[PDB]
């Protein structure tokens, strides 16, 4: 029953048309699938790794964004429409459940303060689809559970800036967040592997959002 | 039959074991989806849109990469399979499908020396899964070709982007390092280049495999 050693670390962000409580829509999603070997037996800023498998997609969110969402991320259901983006259905879920099949099992979905944004609304929009076990393979960590169990803000920002000095670029995009996140990850990479390996919790235990 | 204007360009890389001759296998490749409007309708080196897909994979070839293959791509098998990576499998060219189907039709792959290398490569793989027609619905163009129209002097991917944006490229020789290098090549004129693959898109079934 118990998983063993988490062999990929996938790094996850997303961007919604706005906060909780105004029942969001993911609007952009982003997914670094990064294997163990990378953080245990690695080569101010440390480089990414140089094998790495990345998915970057935007989804037409079937609302408005609050204005505070738009101006923060940069987009809007507009924007996105002028884009010719689609809606977050099967083909999205099935094509999410291929990129992490292309990973080496346990799948450990690591994401920013996930547990209170990202991970429930990724079941939230997939239980919209009937699709509330999809996911269930997969496991996943809250990096800010993992950076105070390792060691004041403990927001993406503040953490880089501790760290390395300096602001990270294309801020508050869920592409930039997430290579920021790898980043931080990336800073003591033994020990938050050794955290990440005893605390992955099962993704099924993450309950939807709303629905 | 007329397809009308390219509704989205997927800006496409790929590295494998080797050059042609050697019958090669894919060993990375990326996907960046861009909107048309992103070059018709725009806002030194012009920024990537805000809004884009990006799918960049990693695949496990089969058999070795040859030594020069892995000096210019910094990717090796045994490196691969340290990275626990999968072959180009029907998962793979679902993957590849599901991406494909997010973006509206018609879809033109913009590859940089595209028709000798990138597209009989991925025509190859397909067929090899015996998916020989599971992107027909594809249209391809060779940004070598617009380029040197556009510009109607070496044509590589380094020397075009030295001599409009005066410096190198970042991470050339991986497949998103050169897929967004071609990206700001290709928004030099976005709408001359627009114009020019509207013109000249051709139907991805006319590529035929590499080998096979
Ligand atoms: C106390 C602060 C520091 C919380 C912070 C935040 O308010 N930042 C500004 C902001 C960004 C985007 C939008 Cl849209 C807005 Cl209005 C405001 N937040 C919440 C937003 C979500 C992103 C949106 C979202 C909402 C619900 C579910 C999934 C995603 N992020 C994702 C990250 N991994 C963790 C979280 C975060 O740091
Ligand atoms: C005459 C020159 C200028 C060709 C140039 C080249 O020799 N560069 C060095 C090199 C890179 C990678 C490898 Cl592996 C090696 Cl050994 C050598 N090439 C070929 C390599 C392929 C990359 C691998 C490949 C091989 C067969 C089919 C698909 C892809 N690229 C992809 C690009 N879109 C167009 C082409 C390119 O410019
Ligand atoms: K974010
Ligand atoms: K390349």
Same mark, same amino acid.
């Not at 990850?185 to 990440?196: D, I, M």
């Given at each position: ?41 690695? =080569? ?61 099992? =346990?799948?450990?979905? /690591? ?29 996943? /960590? ?35 967040? /997430? ?33």
């Amino acid at each position: 029953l118990p998983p063993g050693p988490m062999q990929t670390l996938i790094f996850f962000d997303m961007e919604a048309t706005g906060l909780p409580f105004s029942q969001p829509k993911v609007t952009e999603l982003c997914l670094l699938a990064v294997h163990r070997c990378a953080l245990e037996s690695p =080569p101010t800023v440390p480089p990414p790794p140089r094998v790495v498998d990345k998915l970057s997609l935007c989804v037409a969110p079937g609302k408005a964004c609050s204005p505070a969402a738009s101006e923060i991320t940069g987009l809007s259901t507009a924007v996105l429409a002028a884009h010719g983006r689609q809606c977050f259905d099967d083909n999205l879920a099935n094509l999410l459940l291929a990129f992490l099949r292309r990973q080496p099992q =346990p799948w450990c979905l /690591v994401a920013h303060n996930g547990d209170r944004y990202d991970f429930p609304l990724l079941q939230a929009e997939l239980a919209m689809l009937g699709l509330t076990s999809a996911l269930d393979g997969a496991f996943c /960590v809250d990096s800010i559970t993992a950076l105070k169990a390792l060691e004041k803000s403990y927001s993406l920002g503040s953490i880089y800036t501790r760290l390395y000095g300096q602001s990270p670029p294309d801020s508050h995009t869920a592409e930039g967040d /997430v290579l920021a996140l790898l980043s931080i990850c990336q800073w003591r990479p033994q020990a938050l592997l050794r955290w990440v390996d005893a605390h992955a919790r099962p993704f099924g235990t993450i309950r939807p959002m709303y629905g």
